From a paper:
In this study, we analyzed the mechanism of the substrate recognition of DesB on the basis of the crystal structures of reaction intermediates.
The α and β subunits of LigAB correspond to residues 285−418 (C-terminal domain) and 2−284 (N-terminal domain) of DesB, respectively. The B-factors of the Fe (II) ions are comparable to those of ligand atoms; the averaged B-factor of the Fe (II) ions is 21.0 Å2 and that of the ligand atoms is 18.0 Å2, suggesting that most of the Fe (II) sites of DesB molecules in the crystal are occupied by Fe (II) ions. The R-site is the same as the Fe (II) site of the substrate-free form.
Residue numbers in the entry:
A (entry chain B): 2 to 406
B (entry chain A): 2 to 409
The structure:
Amino acid sequence: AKIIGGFAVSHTPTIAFAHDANKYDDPVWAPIFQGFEPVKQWLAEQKPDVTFYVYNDHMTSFFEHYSHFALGVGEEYSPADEGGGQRDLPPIKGDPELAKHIAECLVADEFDLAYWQGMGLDHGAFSPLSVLLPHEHGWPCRIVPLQCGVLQHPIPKARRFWNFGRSLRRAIQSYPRDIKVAIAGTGGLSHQVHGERAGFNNTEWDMEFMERLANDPESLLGATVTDLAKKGGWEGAEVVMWLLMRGALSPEVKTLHQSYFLPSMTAIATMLFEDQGDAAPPAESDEALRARAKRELAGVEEIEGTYPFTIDRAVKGFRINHFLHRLIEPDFRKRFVEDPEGLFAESDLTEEEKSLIRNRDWIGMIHYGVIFFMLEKMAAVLGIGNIDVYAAFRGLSVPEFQKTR
Amino acid sequence: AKIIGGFAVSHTPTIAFAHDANKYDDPVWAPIFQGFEPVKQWLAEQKPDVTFYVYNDHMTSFFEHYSHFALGVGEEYSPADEGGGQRDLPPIKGDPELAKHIAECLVADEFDLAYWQGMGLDHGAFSPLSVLLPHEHGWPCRIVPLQCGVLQHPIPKARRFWNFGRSLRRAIQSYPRDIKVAIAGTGGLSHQVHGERAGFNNTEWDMEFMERLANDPESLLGATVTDLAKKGGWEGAEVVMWLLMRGALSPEVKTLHQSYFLPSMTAIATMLFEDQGDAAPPAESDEALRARAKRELAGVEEIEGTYPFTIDRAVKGFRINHFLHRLIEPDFRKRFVEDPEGLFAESDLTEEEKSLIRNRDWIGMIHYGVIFFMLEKMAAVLGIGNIDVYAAFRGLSVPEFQKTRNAA
Ligand SMILES: [Fe+2]
Ligand SMILES: [Fe+2]
């Protein structure tokens, strides 16, 4: 519940390439890597427990279903295959409890979210993170990723991103755990990688944007996509993500560091902002905001025989829900009926999970965190009528259940 | 541009099952099917060009990535396999133009959205549609589906569904085509299908909800999920979608019809609302709304050598983008290098799309509507450097391009 600060950093895969290829001595990449050194050192000293990490995915894990603010709620994340294979980094751990609380608060403030788990993190995350955090033998902190749908227009207005950040600050602060959180905003700066204009950069704009972001972010809140794209190249307009992160910080920040390099296509920039705490007590106390986040499901526990599918439950049941979800695939469901144990062998299911499935333990699966609609697919595939399922939920025989109807 | 009205209907698959089993003469299902008739008739008599269709997916097309407001922007939608194979129905056409305009308005209004194409529409849509619309060869109308994430909490507050509906009205009215649009709100009423409370119904609440939704919907806006779930069952709380629909209609509506039946687990209910138009001018004019929705990209066409990836272009380039996106799959990208022609013959690519790929025509693909990040995958898979692609964009040799850079 303490925001220690935030950093802003370009997320080109060229950073990951140079790092993987060992260009720390290279005459071009040496000073660029030295540019990352202050942020890297700050993260090592401050030791944040979680980084809330704002990035965009590059038509890898988000494509056919493309959302504006997608909050990663899962247990851990690994590098996505981008068409080159999986980068050899270990999985970074998520923070499901922080994510849930943040989701509860953001929805209370009327932002519309997406929740995701299990999918790979593209270079949007692992490019800068592999250069800013040691990862030889695990990552030093947890991640709550927020993927922003900045590529398919219309996208949220610059001000919406900023307001997200403002509500995000309160959500993190009001989290009832004594932890240190860093906010990251990635992408940028100026660049365009498509069309006859590919190669566009604007260093004057980059330096102005950075100063405005640091010392007067509200001045940027009326900038349109057109403004940002004219000034910064089409893809450079992703810097609205920097605004989101900047919105999560104290109104006044100390800029501990700024660097800037432009070897190729992308202005590779980094910014380190030290949070200054709060000058005045916030407009609504942490206690009050907590009760507001809780309002919708307050007293749901008094509704007996009911297992709300909350984020915690989704995370708990993810493996088994994911497994059962595959019953929509003709080949998978046919194997499910013909050779379920071979299927169980190849899966990541735990032994209770398999046994729940084995025993057709309907109620036990609901207790466990299987969502009903995945059970329904399992029943239908097995030629078992839903009424059999409902009767078992009630611990009744079918004719007994039928009578109550 | 004209909202003619709305209909509310349960979307239980049991409706589809009864229809497909031909239970129109069943002593239980005859009156129930008679209950859909006024809506069927209204639809056939009114002939909306488009139905904006509010449903929820039942963990089929939306699972690992679960959004609150998912707008379907695609050209068409096929029934989803829900574990029992694909139902035998023709594809329903989408409306990418109206969805793009709606997207632009809702975002101008600070609603955070999702866009989706190509995935199956499940029974939430096809159960009640198959019963309400004739479909022997095609469908009478286009559809803009809005899939709402009502199943994984936290979900948007009831007031947010309603405010979504309020902005949706202005979004549709300001659409600059002279077309008729119906709005469908689906799901409910009372039921609970999981846990020891499974089997719960509340006809008293169901009737009260219908009365309030028709005549005092604003009285509903403060309802918490807890309150809705106690009254209507855990899954009966999906009725927030009826709120969204109702919010898109005129403040006062004419209730042309309502029915209610409870043969099994789910209260099967239908409501038909006739829009009464607007009594006052809207706070903001259509002309001004159109201007505000165009604001973010106004003047973009003056930026040379730039091809914004907007909804119309995402729809256009879908098949080729979907194809190249498959290059993240090990087996697929192997076949792409080793045997592309066999891959093309299995694909739904048009000949010119295959040709663009065959020729490694980077700028052509960009003009055509492939997004850069799919080309980047094709390039890398093929051992082609990004610099070669940028140079081809610029019409320059690789070293003349490299010269524009500060370092190679
Ligand atoms: Fe990016
Ligand atoms: Fe539903």
